[PDB]
Design a protein around this ligand. Structure first.
Ligand SMILES: Cn1ncc2c(=O)[nH]c(CCC(=O)N3CC[C@@H](C(=O)O)C3)nc21
Length: 167
């Protein structure tokens, strides 16, 4: 038993809710919140900008030190940093950004990072400003992630569509 509420169950291990991931994180304080990161951990917009704003820019400060030490992530890769006031940990995961021409097949590699964590609160990778089809992203999620994932979908219209079209 865990503290997530109001989710629709899609499969044995994947759940979905129309929610603002920032507000969901602040209420649940999950062990892991996933950020829709880029390779530079520059949290300007989308999910990343919103999560970072909710940490009063502490996420960005920590991220800049990480990059200065380690260099950029790989597309499809991840790193674990602090969750600040939102979660114990933040798993920064880089899905391919279609608006940069990145290979969509890297989306499966990105979701594989979730399997290193037993339970996660997450957005749909490569959705939103990353330009991928969220329905495809949900399919890859279901077919790749084996651990327990609670997906927060900000847009109510997109949420209902994702549910109504789910196979
Ligand atoms: C602090 N605060 N107060 C009012 C408002 C507001 O109306 N919007 C935002 C930006 C929120 C945002 O961009 N995302 C949340 C989920 C997400 C996704 O893409 O899943 C993108 N922050 C606010």
């Amino acid at each position: 038993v865990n503290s997530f509420s109001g989710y629709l169950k899609l499969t044995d291990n994947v759940y979905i809710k129309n929610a603002d991931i920032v507000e969901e994180a602040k209420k649940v304080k999950p062990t892991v919140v996933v950020n829709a990161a880029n390779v530079y951990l520059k949290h300007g917009g989308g999910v990343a900008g919103a999560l970072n704003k909710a940490t009063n820019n502490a996420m960005q400060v920590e991220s800049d030190d990480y990059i200065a030490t380690n260099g950029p992530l790989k597309v499809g890769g991840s790193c674990v940093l602090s969750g600040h006031n939102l979660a114990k940990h933040c798993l920064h995961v880089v899905g391919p950004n279609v608006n940069k021409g990145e290979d969509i097949q890297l989306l499966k590699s990105a979701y594989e990072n979730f399997n290193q964590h037993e339970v996660l609160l997450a957005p749909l990778l490569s959705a939103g400003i990353f330009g991928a089809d969220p329905i495809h992203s949900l399919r890859v999620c279901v077919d790749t992630v084996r651990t327990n994932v609670y997906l927060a979908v900000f847009d109510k219209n997109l949420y209902d569509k994702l549910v109504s079209s789910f196979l």
